[PDB]
Design a protein around this ligand. Structure first.
Ligand SMILES: COC(=O)/C=C/c1ccc(N(CC(F)(F)F)S(=O)(=O)[C@@H]2C[C@@H]3O[C@H]2C(c2ccc(O)cc2)=C3c2ccc(O)cc2)cc1
Ligand SMILES: COC(=O)/C=C\c1ccc(N(CC(F)(F)F)S(=O)(=O)[C@@H]2C[C@@H]3O[C@H]2C(c2ccc(O)cc2)=C3c2ccc(O)cc2)cc1
Lengths: 221, 231
């Protein structure tokens, strides 16, 4: 493809993703969280359309990626928002919870926030990671041209991460180490998403996960 | 500990040397029932686990951890480790899963067990991805060791902070090792960072498959893992 996305510099990629960032939204615990997530989803769709390369995909492939990524995306945002509140999860500025208000999944989310803190994760890195989640989470479960495009965009995001690190003065060795540390946390975000989904099902909340058709209609709108 | 003093070459040699052996029951009644196929796979996994513990003990850094932390890591990783091994064995058999030399199954056979075809299809896609990437054996063994160290590190006092820090340093050494292998192969710096990312991103898919596998469902107990570690 002669795609605009593939011509982007590291700086343009960061700029696009920072510009696409949704606002931090305000708020029965499950009731509150469901209402918040539902409002977040609307923003997520519109954000996804702004991730470079995402709209080059067929509508079907866009929906597939969103279906596979949505809860991981919510989670990573939660973790980012909570990074400067040790021991707490900032679901919203008016819904900031500690463990006691929880717990298995709460504890996993808190450990991720601690990891982000210990690594001094930067906003520019965060937005790259969130975009990787969107592009990567569904890419192994899809056509050939689409997968190739996704992987080329993913490679651009890698290049962008490395450029950011090099600009901040990290040595080559530090760059590769940090890249790996950031990407390895994604496996834990996937794990938490799967546990979350298993828990949404266990609480009889199958209804609240967005369907293929819901996402499709939301993308078209 | 000297694990963190290893060179990239020594890390690769240690991991290659540590590799566990590769059979299923001879002449099982075929076709399989749901019960009989699950019986075969359970028997195979159970025997593989014993060799997995022996392998884990030889992953540089692993035995520096407390016994409790060793078991925690194995509890979190065991299914992913079995699955990556399966995917690796299956690379040169497009459309098939080489559970054992004598148990080579296609996706239609996954249908014999309720819920299993979906996991089979994900495993097959991973094998195709490894093939498309020309995954090398030296890379494979690094990735498998990453899984062991990474999967449970986020779900663990001064001691605990030192345990986590040690794990992360060993993970850093394996990263360095992967990069060295790539640089030695002649990849450009850009190509190196790209391939590293591509490989680590597949690990999130392996996680996913393990989680789904665990669900749809014979899981090894804390006590069994601990006994095997001590023996
Ligand atoms: C009646 O109220 C109750 O008793 C039940 C209370 C309760 C409350 C949360 C629980 N989880 C574990 C966590 F986050 F708490 F640690 S979670 O299921 O994995 C699930 C995941 C994550 O936390 C839940 C919630 C969610 C998502 C979609 C919905 O439609 C409704 C809720 C998430 C979320 C993350 C980021 C964000 O920006 C917005 C939402 C578990 C029991
Ligand atoms: C925990 C135990 C467990 C039980 C069955 C499960 N699945 C079926 C299910 F659940 F889908 F029906 S599976 O994901 O396909 C899982 C994957 C693959 O098929 C299953 C099986 C297994 C592993 C341990 C057992 O005791 C029994 C069966 C596999 C395997 C075996 C050896 C190997 O070298 C590589 C892969 C998953 C988790």
């Amino acid at each position: 493809k002669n795609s605009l996305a593939l011509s982007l510099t590291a700086d343009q990629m960061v700029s696009a993703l920072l510009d696409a960032e949704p606002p931090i939204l305000y708020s029965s615990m499950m009731g509150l969280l469901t209402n918040l997530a539902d409002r977040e989803l609307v923003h997520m769709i519109n954000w996804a359309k702004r991730v470079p390369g995402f709209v080059d995909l067929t509508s079907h492939d866009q929906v597939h990626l969103l279906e596979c990524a949505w809860l991981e995306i919510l989670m990573i945002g939660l973790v980012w928002r909570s990074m400067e509140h040790p021991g707490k999860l900032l679901f919203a500025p008016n819904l900031l919870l500690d463990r006691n208000q929880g717990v298995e999944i709460f504890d996993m989310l808190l450990a991720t926030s601690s990891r982000f803190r210990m690594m001094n994760l930067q906003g520019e890195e965060f937005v790259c990671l969130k975009s990787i989640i969107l592009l990567n989470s569904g890419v192994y479960t899809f056509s050939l041209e689409e997968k190739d495009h996704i992987h080329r965009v993913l490679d651009k995001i890698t290049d962008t991460l490395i450029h950011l690190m090099a600009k901040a003065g990290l040595t080559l060795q530090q760059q590769h180490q940090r890249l790996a540390q950031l990407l390895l946390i994604l496996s834990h975000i996937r794990h938490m998403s799967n546990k979350g989904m298993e828990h949404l099902y266990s609480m009889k909340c199958k209804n609240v996960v967005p369907s293929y058709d819901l996402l499709l209609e939301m993308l078209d709108a």
